[PDB]
Amino acid sequence: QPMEEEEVETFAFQAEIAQLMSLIINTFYSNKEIFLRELISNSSDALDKIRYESLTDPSKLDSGKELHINLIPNKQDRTLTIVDTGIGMTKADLINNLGTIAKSGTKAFMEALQAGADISMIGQFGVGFYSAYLVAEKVTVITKHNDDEQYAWESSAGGSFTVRTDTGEPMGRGTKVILHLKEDQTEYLEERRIKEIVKKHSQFIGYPITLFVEKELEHHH
Ligand SMILES: Cc1cc(-c2c(Cl)cccc2OCCCC(F)(F)F)nc(N)n1
């Protein structure tokens, strides 16, 4: 008789990834806006990937031809969501690429920071995604790859993350990164702030970037 039932898996982050997340989410930096550049950069790469695949197999765009990036601030939920129609991830991709297997860059980046590097260089070590925790207390990733189910990944950086099937609104293809913002980081929900950050840092992204300001209408939250 339950409306829904689903299995939820909990995985431990690999140690260096856990270490990186703790350093990022706890440390003061004065240039936190760079997180948006890193996430938009990931979307652009994911969009490059599906586009490349579609070169030799057009039917890979049966799940949607438009290649673009949406930014969706929601003040009532205090969330900023970055959505793309890129290649998406399989369940194994989520588990493997978002916490259980460390690349050398995870330790390299922390080494670099010790050697005097700047947090803004995180993208050069292939781990820019985790810069999301500069501004977010929790991150939810919803993703759909061709021929696969839609999955939801989530972590509040406790040393572990969860994976489960996402039964909400079906995406055609791609990835949503939902940032549940820290209380003092709500500036990044403001249209003015989002525009100036995109203009400054993402000028050379070769895909449409579109803002959708989300508001839940009264009595209809
Ligand atoms: C498929 C996908 C994957 C990611 C992504 C996430 Cl959520 C966490 C950590 C690394 C990532 O990509 C690395 C690059 C993945 C590549 F090469 F497929 F683009 N982001 C988006 N928007 N889309």
Ligand 1 center–CA 15 separation, angstroms: 20
Collapse the DSSP code of 149 into the 3-class scheme (helix H, G, I; strand E, B; otherwise coil) and give the result: coil
Q: Give phi and psi for 215, each to the nearest 5.
A: -135, 125
Is 73 touching ligand 1 by the criterion CB < 6 Å? no
Whether the Cβ atoms of residue 157 and residue 22 lie closer than 8 Å to each other: yes
Strand partners, 179: 80, 139
Beta bridge partners of 140: 154, 178
**Hunting for tokens 């590097």 — which residue is that?**
117
| Contact between 181 and 135 (Cβ < 8 Å) | yes
Judge contact between 94 and 153, C-beta under 8 A.
yes
Tell me which architecture the domain covering 1-221 has in CATH: 2-Layer Sandwich (3.30)
Instruction: Report the C-alpha gap between 151 and 144 in whole angstroms.
Output: 7
The ligand 1 atom at the shortest distance from the C-alpha of residue 89 is: 1
CB 46 within 8 A of CB 175: yes
**Resolution in angstroms, to 1 decimal, for this deposition?**
2.0
> Are 12 and 174 spatial neighbours (Cβ–Cβ below 8 Å)?
no
Tokens read off for 133: 């925790």
> Which amino acid, residue 126?
G
Three-class DSSP category at 200: helix
Whether 86 lines ligand 1, by a CB cut-off of 6 Å, is yes
Report the Cα–Cα distance between both ends of the chain, in Å, rounded. Answer: 26
Contact between 45 and 198 under an 8 Å Cβ cutoff? The reply is no
Contacts of 27 (CB under 8 A, 6+ apart): none
* Residue 219 DSSP code: T
What SS3 string covers 181-192? ECHHHHHHHCHH
Give SS3 for 174.
Answer: strand
Radius of gyration of the chain (CA): 17
Residues 83 and 69: beta-carbon distance below 8 Å: yes
Q: Which token pair is 209?
A: 């970037």
3-state secondary structure 22-91: HHHHHCCCCCCCHHHHHHHHHHHHHHHHHHHHHHHCHHHHCCCCCCCEEEEEECCCCEEEEEECCCCCCH
- Which of 13, 71, 129, 161 gets mutated to test ligand 1 (max ligand atoms within 8 A of its CB)? 129
Token couple for 192:
């003015």
Closest C-alpha to 41, from 158, 141, 139, 129: 129
- CA dist 128 and 142 (Å) reads 18
d(CA 157, CA 161): 7
Query: What are phi and psi for residue 216, nearest 5 degrees?
Result: -80, 120
Are the C-beta atoms of residues 177 and 139 closer than 8 Å to each other?
A: yes
Which tokens in the block code for residue 81? 């969501």
Q: Name the 3-class secondary structure at 206.
A: coil
Strand boundaries in 86-201, DSSP class E: 136-144, 150-155, 160-165, 174-181
How far CA 13 is from CA of 1, 5, 29, 99, in Å, comes to 35, 26, 23, 5
**Which residues, at least 6 apart from 30, have a Cβ–Cβ distance to it below 8 Å?**
none
The CA 128 to ligand 1 mean position distance, Å, reads 10
Query: Which backbone phi and psi does 74 adopt, to 5 degrees?
Result: -135, 100
Domain range summary for the chain, segments of one domain joined by +: 1-221
Nearest CA to ligand 1 atom 8: 129
Long-range Cβ pairs for the range 109-112 (8 Å, 24+): 109/20, 110/16, 110/19, 110/20, 110/23
Using alpha carbons only, give the angle 211, 93, 102 rounded to the nearest 5 degrees.
Answer: 105
